[PDB]
């Protein structure tokens, strides 16, 4: 018992060229039936399956981003020089010292030390509580790959198409030419927590002249610590008959603190299925912010005679149902697809009713029995859902009671207004 | 009233953990320091060790007209954080609470820092209670944690790695450590300053014979961590941070180098440091590294020598507060 | 004196994305005027210039293709063995010998030698007149590059965009993603004469098992000669009381002869501006049989304030004309373009009249006077041709009496039927 | 009537070029070979050298019952291509035409190959004319070239490189060469077979003393090319093709190895070769390489030894026809 739920029939009078713009986290399923222009009853299946985008980024390990606390201390001496004694800030992890050597007058002098031009006033800015807050990587190069499978008549061919490669067969050619990317080289990816949580994108990550407060000021490189300088100047505040204290009118908040303050002003990104090594970082972008340009061309010299002997026979039967026919609940259909006269055959099964088809599922069937699950949403009260191939469907169906990041394009003519609100 | 906050976990768990909290109080005059007694109204079992009399060499400086006169004498203090061996390590089992203070002093005034350590069961028995120190009242507040599996660290809920093998997120946590005097009859296993010297020295120091160790608590609650534990990554981390920040991690005016006799009965100088004025910043208590038998020092207005690269006249602090990065999971 | 011959004005309410399919031997010129959506009178020029396609093919030098003549000789001996004496064919360049050792009966024997099983009949096939007819190269890898220049407001940026690279600026991004190619790896390019004359494409170029008649049978490799075997078998034709002659029923014509016979059955290609080295072969394909997919995107955060201060002023004047206004003859116009307040400015001049514009010329003007030639075809009797920028044109014009592999796209509204046959 | 085609260039040009053509005629019986005289009705100035009497050793084989009997004797031939030194080299200046034949023979019959060489001016004076040889008439046809700058080669118009320095298309052209006997008093500069031996030998041959050289014409017209000219790429090419195809480049039945005495007055064998029957294929004339003074051989039914890798009993052919690749431009 078959029903008119076939695929788009395309006569091969001329070559079949196609251009695609695949989103980042999207898998395409384009299938038609190429018709011999010399015989209306000679048709061969053509299936095109393209996977998601795999982003391969050769990166440079920048290290760990450290967060510290600002501290300032002052050290006064009556006689000697500033380069004679030691100070507790000189032994810290990061420290910057500005000393007023031989600048002991009398207005800044304490009640002790009745001398002029003989003392020393050293000021030390150091950072404590250094703790790692995230990991930083720098993009060196980018590479985008997609896995494509074709099914023409009885032939099946698969390949991982790169930017400098194409899946070329005797009749079909699939090329990957362009890629619009959110990421580009010389960018800095910062992961605050683990990888799966995503991260942020920084462009002006300081490398040579880092200051306290800039993104990347304090870094825990594998060679050692890399401390920045300060954004400000020193000054000596003093009163009469008091020890001269040291002031610093500059930036006090660290780079991580300012980043948390204005985190909304930076670019965010997510990752899925991450794989990081000592040289690369592979992941799939789920935000669908990248587009790949794919060119497919099928010549009209298909030789319909060679692709017609012993085609792939497919039988199916609906065996189980679970869910509801309401628009929003969804139902799950189980099909027992039996493939014969072919070792492997790439096609797709649809869950159809008397009128429409509310779901599809692409699967590479093996010679024998195959269990296929199909998800669907919609239907009416008396909708008897069945499993369906191109034209042939199951003998019986089942009835129910009371997105997925896949794209299906089979060229089937959808039902008009007669199937709306019935 | 000061505030000593205790962060309470949701469960007791494996039994051997302690809670810890601490607060630095306002300045008191020096003359009052010798009278300071910790009082408690709390419903816990105070360990009596720390409130006994404990001999210190007091080392002080005065301006003179290098430009300094120092002097020293032997006095008895009470209530300081001189914890005997095993007391902290077995507190979870004994159900004893340790309450003691350290002193951060200039020439004229001291800020006591009160430390409270005790069993996690205290969190079941107690919401708040009071400690007194001289004329100051301290409100201890036991507060239940925002987190489900860990502790609130830098505004983030964190659980550190637990396995004994090698395998994560990284969070910086507070560590608080107490110096414990502990001798053995034979060998160098307890020569703590030798451990520092291997980490930060070029050449061989002759005589750093102090015998003891640090006992530390990590974050607001943990099992005690013994320093040094040679194959423990956290011990290694604490020791390295100690070696670079020997007075702990976190206006004071430096005046110059001073020396003195500790104990005061020594004929020549056995200690050095840096005299300062202004606001006390670091703790003013430690032990000479040179003597097997501990010589305890209280040096108000002087940052006693703690640089481990130096051979002579150096010290170890009685308490030490710093931060180490831990690997784990943020949740 | 200006006339409404402006470019396409595009309001920047949203981002401007574009997809291009450039032919092989084609240069594109896309220019518009991006308008500030907050001020109708604030417009900045946007120019996009893309050069022709440069094909870089890492090749393998196969050597020279040799052409020879088929020859067969026979040598008979009465006593001894075939591996005892020498033959004149053994010293040739290419030779294949099949001998009937010890097969001397009596029906094939001459009037002499009344013996059985003692003679020797050697047959030698050799090739003479070996002369080179062409050079062969084998494609190992392919690379396609295009040089692109952008002009936005007062900024000018150029770069050679590869397949793994993009011209990325603060507001414009040009990427090269896909390339539909007539050539693909493992192909054999054969040049009969010089390079500029083009060549042929061979797929089944014999490498291991070469036979006489196949493309690539006799090769003059730099190591030495590489001779093939023969497509046939030997036989001994003999009569009574006659010396046994040797026959060879196989292929006689060489590989070059058969290639000349069926030359029309092979793929041909042309080259322009060739550059060959010991490792590569660079050329531009003039047949326009390759298509490059280019993606251009301009963000709407153009900051019209920064790109408005001190724009590029351009003055022009028509100074010479030469040709006719007939549809087919063509005319050449000379313009004296004066660029001020900008060091370099990329734009294009058009040869317009009161109604239409019959030609254009893109040039990167320098600060000062610039002589620009414009070719045009068309016009009427009273057509006074003038030089024109976007809006401003020259003060006067000139009148006449009695493709180029460039593509121009400025978005200007062309004249309707009012300019046809007037 | 045979046909001897001369391809005529459009211009004379630089003056020193010659035209050349050749044709192989049908078989004549051996007894008639000694009577063969070239006659000419052509309007050109025949050089008289080649029609004089020239002494050859005739070397022949017969079946016997290794299975061969060979014999030899001294006879005089006329009209063969034994061209004296300078005759071809200066023919453009002297305006002399050389017409002579070589012989390609089996035991019973010979095919003469007639060679005609002469000044390019003949192309102005002459459209066609007749040569006779015995009972055969030869039609010489002078035909103007399809090309503008070069010569029709393999159906293609070709012009070779002209510069003396090093710098193109490649075309294979015919080369025809004539052996010239030429002695010097001192040294090895004219020892032609030594040149072959350096190119194709492992070890040292003792006695290959023939003194002479080849003079060659390239294509249908060229200046004479002297072999060997050591630094000339074309000389190198001709010599290498000679070394691999010593009887020239282009059913015959091989019978076996034969030896003989040349001249016949020698007490032992001085020559070897391969006896054959059937259609004559190669020329049957040459010179012994062993003697300074040329010993000319005519060996009908025998391919005389020309393999340069052999040391003894070998020969050089009187004429040699082959092909070499030339760099140039096809147009
Ligand atoms: C050891 O450290 C202690 C504590 O850090 C320190 O003693 C304190 O010094 C401050 C300032 O030197 C004292 O502050 C005073 O507080 C009274 C309280 O009412 C104020 O009225 C005073 O104000 C006057 O003085 C200021 C002088 O600059 C003026 O700006 C102001 O307008 C007023 O005229 C005054 O600030 C404080 O009382 C003591 N604290 C204690 C506990 O005694 C001490 O100096 C350090 N010792 C050394 C040797 O450095
Ligand atoms: C030296 O070379 C010469 C020339 O290549 C060669 O002499 C020639 O031999 C052929 C065949 O052996 C002779 O051909 C004959 O021609 C006459 C002319 O009318 C024919 O009638 C003959 O035909 C009969 O013989 C054939 C035998 O197979 C039959 O197939 C046929 O039907 C006829 O019965 C015959 O073919 C030719 O005449 C001579 N040429 C000369 C110039 O004498 C000679 O054999 C070679 N010598 C040696 C020793 O190898
Ligand atoms: C810790 O002590 C060591 C030894 O006294 C100090 O090291 C010296 O420091 C000065 C200046 O930095 C150098 O010129 C010397 O060469 C160092 N000597 C040695 C032996 O290392 C070190 O600076 C002290 N650290 C402090 C005061 O923080
Ligand atoms: C030319 O002469 C040489 C020497 O007689 C021949 O070389 C010998 O050939 C045989 C078989 O090819 C080899 O087994 C010997 O090792 C060769 N000997 C030397 C010394 O090279 C050569 O074959 C002859 N060429 C011919 C008859 O064409
Ligand atoms: C990452 O995923 C979260 C999930 O809620 C989403 O809100 C966010 O927009 C995603 N990131 C980007 C850049 O789209
Ligand atoms: C090469 O150029 C010639 C010029 O006439 C043209 O006829 C031929 O078609 C071109 N080759 C191809 C493959 O288009």
Residue numbers in the entry:
A (entry chain D), C (entry chain A): 668 to 1069, 1082 to 1101
B (entry chain G), D (entry chain B): 27 to 91, 102 to 203, 209 to 291, 301 to 381
The authors write:
Cryo-ET of purified PUUV VLPs, in tandem with sub-tomogram averaging, revealed that the VLP surface displays the expected Gn−Gc spike architecture that can form locally ordered lattices, as observed in native hantavirions. Consistent with previous studies of hantavirus ultrastructure and Gc oligomerization, breakpoints exist in the (Gn−Gc)4 lattices. Previous studies have suggested that contacts between (Gn−Gc)4 spikes are mediated by Gc homo-dimers, while lattice breaks are expected to display Gc (‘lattice-free Gc’) molecules that are not integrated within the lattice assembly through Gc homo-dimer interactions. Drawing upon the fitting generated above, we used a 13.9 Å cryo-ET reconstruction of the lattice-incorporated (non-Fab P-4G2 treated) PUUV VLP surface to create a model of the higher-order (Gn−Gc)4 spike lattice.
Entry of a hantavirus into a host cell is negotiated by two membrane-anchored glycoproteins, Gn and Gc, which form a lattice decorating the lipid bilayer envelope of the mature virion. The Gc adopts a three-domain (domains I−III) class II fusion protein architecture and is postulated to associate closely with the Gn, linking adjacent Gn tetramers. Endosomal escape is mediated by the Gc in a process that involves engagement of the target membrane by the Gc-encoded fusion loop, followed by upward ‘zippering action’ conformational rearrangements of the transmembrane-anchored Gc domain III, which bring together host and viral membranes. Here we structurally characterize the epitope of mAb P-4G2, a potently neutralizing antibody derived following experimental infection of bank voles with Puumala virus (PUUV), a hantavirus responsible for one of the most frequently occurring hantaviral diseases, a mild form of HFRS known as nephropathia epidemica (NE).
